[PDB]
Design a protein around this ligand. Structure first.
Ligand SMILES: *[C@@H]1O[C@H](CO)[C@@H](O[C@@H]2O[C@H](CO)[C@@H](O)[C@H](O)[C@H]2NC(C)=O)[C@H](O)[C@H]1NC(C)=O
Ligand SMILES: *[C@@H]1O[C@H](CO)[C@@H](O[C@@H]2O[C@H](CO)[C@@H](O)[C@H](O)[C@H]2NC(C)=O)[C@H](O)[C@H]1NC(C)=O
Ligand SMILES: *[C@@H]1O[C@H](CO)[C@@H](O[C@@H]2O[C@H](CO)[C@@H](O)[C@H](O)[C@@H]2O)[C@H](O)[C@H]1NC(C)=O
Ligand code: ACK
Ligand code: ACK
Ligand code: NAG
Ligand code: NAG
Ligand code: NAG
Ligand code: NAG
Ligand code: NAG
Ligand code: NAG
Ligand code: NAG
Ligand code: NAG
Ligand code: NAG
Lengths: 772, 772
RNA sequence: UUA
RNA sequence: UUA
């Protein structure tokens, strides 16, 4: 169909709307800019390659470029690969960019540059030089950037990329940049706010530096500033997972009371990890628009009990006061000031790491009439006691987070403790009201524990110690609960009445409850599903289930069952017929995951035993060594079959003769060495075929008829063992001239032989010598 | 060194003392008996091959054979591989064995034989025919076995290898076998004890059959019997993990009261899973020598409270009454009869699965004066309450087992519930008194819990719910404890005083206590080791440790640290020097396991950071992509280095220049494609080198000097990519003629090329054309 | 590949 | 391979 094969090792996209020709060569092991890049190219990405230099030749023809992304072709030693250390810094020749009249964005982050590159065109709006070795900014080097709006200069001097001196910025270096909106100088070992800065700034990032003092006029002319981040100047260093040097005598960052007086437009103020002991009300006198305030990782425990400054923040949406506890103190109570009640617009309040023994209803009374409050995060507080009934006065909330506490009768895993959570690289909430009790010490539960919480839509009990024989009495008040996460407990399914009181339960997660399934002679009633009349989804992954008192699971409602990481190999021991119908009476089941069940083979009766509307079956990662393909005829509604990461060596003689319904066949990471002669013949239903990471040498036309290939949304063939002899003439031609989407066609569809052509892409292969 | 290359694909051993020539061809993918088996061969093993027949040709020359092991060359469909099903049963021609005048043992198990093979020589003492299809035994077929002493006929008719009829044994079929000592007819669907049996029997195995009734004279003449097993006739089938058919009418196996009167010599009586409700004293009237009695999986709950039969068993060493509970009953107490106190010789008492709520001191009073009691096993009883101080009256015991209970304030994983625990295939006790509390519901511990248990040498708390901040007050009474297993709990290392009260602790296991290490901003005091002055071995595997409040671990005593499955990659993040000395002050440390820590590289300073006496270092399974071999020079006492399952592509230019001490280098499962020119030159200290499962093409003599190779105890080279051209002449010759042990030389040391020689063993490779 |  |  295609007249000219695409040989270029980069993804090319067209967006004729926004008038872009997008060439993405991210991570293609390039040592040169590839030849033959389209002349109409507008966005060119060469991130993560080993191109040692740029010159006038680099972009000679590419005069329509609006964006070059040339990040991480020489990333600093400590940040980059140790197995492929860049030997010498990126070399930028004179006149390399001055021809690109239309260039609006240039990313040269992570190239070990020593200086701000010169001869940039006046069209440039965005320049990024993060993770280089530029630690002295001179006015003279910045004249070329007259029209610049966004300037990223961070991560040029810090523990992962040191310069061993203080950062230098000439007086007024940036003042003549009259269009500058965003300046980032984070993670740079800066000692003072550089002045004077242009009044056109909207965003100023000065975090993770060595600034001990703010002068009262440092921010004087910045009447357009919207975002200010001064975090990590005078850090709180307790349990820091990076090298952390506080200011002497554990002094706070010193901020005059009138330092923010000009910032009428400020929306975000971040003062994380500044060792603050006091938040003076006077700070917020002329900021009436402040929406987000981060005061996490300070020493504001006392202040939280007083907090007069809150009276000046009626427009605040987000407040973060996490990790303000006094070292070596375990308070009895949380003392929230009445001033919290003036936070009229507050949607989100986080106070992790206050560290207190007992949470009581009254302590939260300042929050009672906050009409817009949506999230209350009291995680990581080592709370031992809480009457959960107190949250009956918080029905309007979307999330109550008591995660990581010590109670007994979505932010990243590292968040409050990472160095730079905004650093650039080279869930049941949607069901309604959520009470997150994950990672507590709840060993026993009873109905009264949930009195007055009938409004709850999701309860998270993951990672507790719950070991009891649930009999259906434990959750009686939770009449509206749609989602229970009971993973990482110690469920004992002695009673088939477990969970039946949750009459509106749609999703049950009982994954990683393997404990009692690990000892012989214990009763397990897997038939507990019968009572849950609206259950849609059941997850029982990683339970190590190798035995069951009940022979069948039953549901009229269940659509999805995850049964990964169990021992169906033992339940279906060849010769034992008793569990061959375990899932058959799940009448509405469409999706079954029985990956990771050590099924090295499937006994006969398994497919017959499957429920009638099964659509999506995974048998991945089972060490399957054999498969009777014909048995797929019992799965009359099968559409998706995942057999990835097994040991299959052969495909069926005629797939169409095995299933009338099959659309998506995943066979990646198997041991397949050849395709059968008529493999895909008349498989009119097929739409997706993954044959990647096998050991295929040859594919002949008979296997791959064009009336089937041409309905495929995608065909994966990469990481095989293709033999590029004259025998392969058809496959080589076809691959070169097909419209069919085949990912990695240029990069990992490769000849392994013979000799001459070893390591060569088949897309690039010239076989004229087969045709003389 | 060797004059004639060993080409036979079997391991050949000499024991010139016992005059044996032992040829072991186990699992060598043979379809033929190999030619050239030594003529002096005495023991020939051909287990697990696909040899389709035996004939007079098979053993023509092998006239000194005393033992043929020809098991599992055609194992029944349900028992064998589904990816390589034996197509047709093993064919044994007339006259195949009649020439083997000296043959004493013939194993033909698992070959799908239909009949007992005839023409066996009169020398035969042992014949094994398990897992065949022989389910009718006729006197006529057994005349040839005049001299036979051991006959295994089991697993010829059961659920995994069905015959679909009752087993048939002719009247008196075995009587004329006047030397028969051991008869096994287990797992055979036998319906009556065959009679009459020879009086020379010492062992009779009739378990897992369909025998409903013992006739009073079935065992009349068996005055030499030592072992009788009638288990699994009328099985107790609750929660059975195999298909289990009880006798109708809930009947027990019916044994007349005088059935054992003749068995004066009986030592072992096994009546497991016979649905017994009563144990009549009259059974044991003329058995005064009985040492082992298994009454597990019956219905003897009531009987345990009475048990008059015990008065007749003063010589009994082992009593097992496990799994006798009445279905649907949860007793308050254990009612042990006073008759237990007459068990004068008892060393081992097991009563798992009695199922009761509360254990109290008095309930065990019948055991108080059993002077030789060594093991009391009360596991899997769902006990909720036990004052552990009761065991102060059991100081003399070696093991108190309360594993798998419900307490709160070595037998195989499947044992009582497996079909045939004696079926043939094709720990802290040694420290002294052990209290095993593993797999209970203990969420909190205090010193008083251990009052009066000062004698304990090992405590097992594995798999409890212990979540507390141990401050060193919790185990105060346990002044003699040498071994604490605290794995699979939720250790919170807030206090560096944790465990310090255990002044004699030699082994601490705190593995799989990952819970609190998974959440940011939690204090962990890894320096807690300092206070344990005699600690030899610390295991803290799978703790997911990625952060630590202390920078160094300290011990004067510690020899072995297991730190597998943690996040040293995070602790040693490039640029962070703070934890590079974490193990340095473990001054006597010899063994460090830091496998599975995602160390894709080692920062410089890690080797310098190692303690000075390190002998055995594992860096396995880290995804290591690079390794500065020269830095091994800091490890002046290094003997074993395990770098298995990594991504290394190169070896050092000269290993001797890296380490003077290194004896054992494990490099298996890496990506190594060639060896350096002088790799092993002058590395005379080397004794073990595993280079298996790499991608090596060539090895030249310069890399592999013979003055080093020859003193290797072992050299592993299998599963590489060897190219068998004239360039490989040296390696091929050396491999063919070396004394040095190289495993799998016959099976997986293979040429991948070129063309001709692909898939061929290098041992078998003829390279004469390289020498014309 | 008799569990 | 800026976290
Ligand atoms: C940030 O700048 C500081 C101080 O300006 C640097 O600290 C100096 O480092 C040199 C070389 O290591 C030492 O000889 C001096 O003792 C240090 N001076 C002071 C006053 O501390 C520091 O290296 C810089 N940080 C980074 C990460 O580059
Ligand atoms: C070689 O074959 C002989 C004959 O089967 C084996 O000797 C037997 O070993 C058992 C072990 O329990 C002894 O108790 C018996 O007395 C021996 N039987 C006979 C008939 O002599 C010998 O062990 C075999 N050796 C090897 C390594 O396979
Ligand atoms: C043990 O012997 C049984 C008979 O005593 C076998 O049961 C028979 O099975 C056939 C059909 O397969 C029935 O139609 C017939 O009524 C009879 O009861 C049983 O299969 C056998 N056990 C094994 C494991 O082979
Ligand atoms: N707390 C408990 N947890 C699990 N099983 C229990 C408990 N109490 C009694 N059992 C009984 O133990 C047996 C094995 O699980 C099982 O048989 P059952 O009589 O049906 O009740 C049960
Ligand atoms: N049970 C507990 N487990 C862990 N930390 C606790 C506990 N109770 C109070 N803390 C305090 O939480 C902090 C982070 O772990 C830690 O620093 P600290 O102030 O010394 O005391 C502690
Ligand atoms: C192309 O470049 C322009 C300007 O830098 C930018 O706004 C646009 O997002 C880019 N698109 C892509 C997909 O790179
Ligand atoms: C809360 O703390 C503030 C300031 O530390 C203090 O003045 C106030 O009295 C405290 N209130 C309670 C209820 O402890
Ligand atoms: C919890 O608070 C509620 C008030 O909503 C009350 O009914 C109940 O008694 C309290 N429970 C406990 C254990 O204090
Ligand atoms: C429950 O909390 C756990 C751990 O804190 C988290 O992994 C999980 O995604 C949460 N469950 C849901 C359904 O959001
Ligand atoms: C589950 O199985 C058992 C029999 O094994 C039965 O008593 C029980 O009622 C079943 N439960 C349901 C909910 O169907
Ligand atoms: C099939 O199920 C898997 C879950 O294993 C899911 O990720 C995938 O999208 C499903 N595909 C279809 C077509 O439903
Ligand atoms: C498979 O092919 C044969 C012959 O073409 C035909 O009899 C049989 O019905 C086919 N089965 C299916 C499911 O198409
Ligand atoms: C403790 O018990 C556990 C769980 O049964 C077992 O894995 C482990 O071997 C025991 N530990 C010791 C030291 O015996
Ligand atoms: C462990 O380290 C901490 C400081 O990080 C210190 O307070 C404590 O005393 C140390 N304990 C021991 C036994 O070394």
């Amino acid at each position: 169909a295609r007249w000219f094969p695409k040989t270029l090792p980069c993804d090319v996209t067209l967006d004729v709307s926004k008038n872009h020709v997008i060439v993405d060569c991210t991570d293609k092991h390039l040592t040169e800019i590839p030849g033959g890049i389209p002349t109409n190219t507008t966005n060119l990405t060469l991130t993560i390659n080993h191109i040692p230099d740029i010159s006038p030749a680099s972009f000679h023809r590419l005069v329509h470029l609006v964006e070059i992304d040339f990040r991480c072709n020489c990333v600093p030693i400590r940040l980059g690969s140790k197995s492929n250390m860049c030997p010498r810094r990126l070399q930028i020749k004179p006149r390399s960019f001055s021809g690109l009249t239309y260039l609006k964005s240039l990313y040269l982050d992570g190239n070990q540059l020593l200086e701000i590159p010169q001869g940039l065109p006046p069209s440039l709006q965005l320049l990024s030089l993060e993770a280089n070795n530029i630690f002295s900014i001179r006015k003279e080097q910045l004249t070329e950037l007259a029209n610049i709006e966004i300037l990223y200069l961070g991560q040029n001097c810090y523990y992962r990329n040191p310069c061993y001196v203080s950062y230098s910025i000439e007086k007024d270096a940036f003042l003549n940049l009259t269009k500058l909106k965003v300046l980032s100088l984070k993670d740079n070992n800066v000692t003072t706010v550089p002045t004077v800065l242009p009044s056109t700034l909207t965003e100023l990032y000065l975090y993770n530096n060595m600034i001990a003092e703010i002068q009262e006029d440092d921010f004087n002319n910045l009447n357009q500033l919207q975002i200010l981040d001064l975090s990590g100047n005078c850090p709180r260093c307790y349990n820091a997972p990076f090298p952390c040097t506080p200011c002497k005598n554990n002094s706070p960052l010193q901020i005059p009371v009138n330092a923010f007086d000009a910032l009428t437009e400020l929306k975000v103020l971040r003062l994380h990890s500044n060792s603050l002991q006091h938040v003076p009300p006077r700070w917020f006198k002329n900021i009436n628009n402040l929406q987000e305030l981060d005061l996490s990782q300070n020493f504001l425990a006392k202040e939280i009990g007083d907090a007069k400054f809150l009276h000046f923040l009626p427009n605040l949406i987000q407040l973060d006061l996490s990790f303000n506890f006094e070292l070596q103190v375990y308070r009895a109570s949380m003392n929230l000031s009445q001033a919290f009640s003036s936070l009229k617009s507050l949607k989100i309040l986080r106070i992790r790491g206050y560290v207190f023994k007992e949470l009581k209803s009254f302590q939260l009374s300042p929050l009672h009439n906050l009409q817009n409050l949506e999230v209350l995060d009291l995680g990581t507080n080592f709370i031992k006691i809480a009457n959960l009934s107190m949250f009956k006065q918080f029905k309007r909330l979307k999330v109550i987070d008591l995660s990581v506490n010590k109670i007994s009768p979505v932010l990243e895993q590292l968040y409050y403790f990472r160095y730079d959570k905004y650093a650039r690289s080279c869930s049941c909430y949607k069901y309604g009201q959520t009470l997150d009790l994950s990672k507590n010490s709840i060993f026993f539960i009873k109905s009264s524990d949930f009195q007055h919480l009938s409004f709850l839509k999701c309860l998270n009990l993951s990672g507790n110690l719950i070991s009891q024989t649930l009999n259906g009495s434990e959750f009686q008040p939770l009449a509206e609960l749609r989602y229970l996460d009971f993973s990482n407990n110690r469920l004992d399914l002695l009673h088939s009445t477990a969970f039946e009181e949750l009459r509106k339960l749609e999703v049950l997660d009982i994954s990683s409850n393997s404990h009692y399934f690990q000892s012989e002679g214990i009763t397990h009633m897997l038939n507990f599903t019968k009572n849950l009349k609206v259950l849609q989804k059941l997850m029982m992954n990683d339970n190590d289930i190798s035995s069951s008192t009940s022979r069948t699971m039953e549901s009229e409602s269940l659509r999805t069952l995850e049964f990964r990481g169990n021992h169906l190999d033992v339940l279906w021991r060849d010769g034992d017929n008793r569990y061959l119908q375990l899932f058959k009476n799940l009448l509405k089941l469409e999706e079954l995951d029985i990956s990771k069940n050590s099924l090295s083979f499937l006994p006969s009766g398994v497919f017959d035993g499957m429920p009638p509307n099964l659509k999506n079956l995974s048998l991945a990662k089972n060490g399957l060594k054999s498969f009777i393909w014909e048995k797929l005829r019992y799965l009359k509604n099968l559409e998706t079959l995942d057999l990835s990461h097994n040991q299959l060596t052969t495909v069926p003689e005629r797939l169409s003769n095995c299933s009338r319904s099959l659309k998506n066949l995943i066979l990646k990471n198997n041991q397949i060495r050849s395709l059968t002669k008529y493999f895909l013949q008349d498989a009119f239903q097929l739409r997706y075929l993954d044959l990647s990471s096998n050991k295929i040498q040859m594919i002949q036309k008979t296997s791959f008829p064009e009336n089937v290939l041409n309905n495929l949304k995608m065909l994966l063939l990469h990481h095989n063992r293709f033999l590029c002899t004259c025998d392969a003439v058809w496959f080589v031609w076809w691959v070169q001239h097909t419209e069919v989407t085949i990912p990695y066609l240029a990069t990992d569809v490769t000849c392994v032989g013979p000799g001459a052509h070893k390591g060569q892409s088949v897309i690039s292969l010239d076989l004229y010598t087969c045709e003389l």
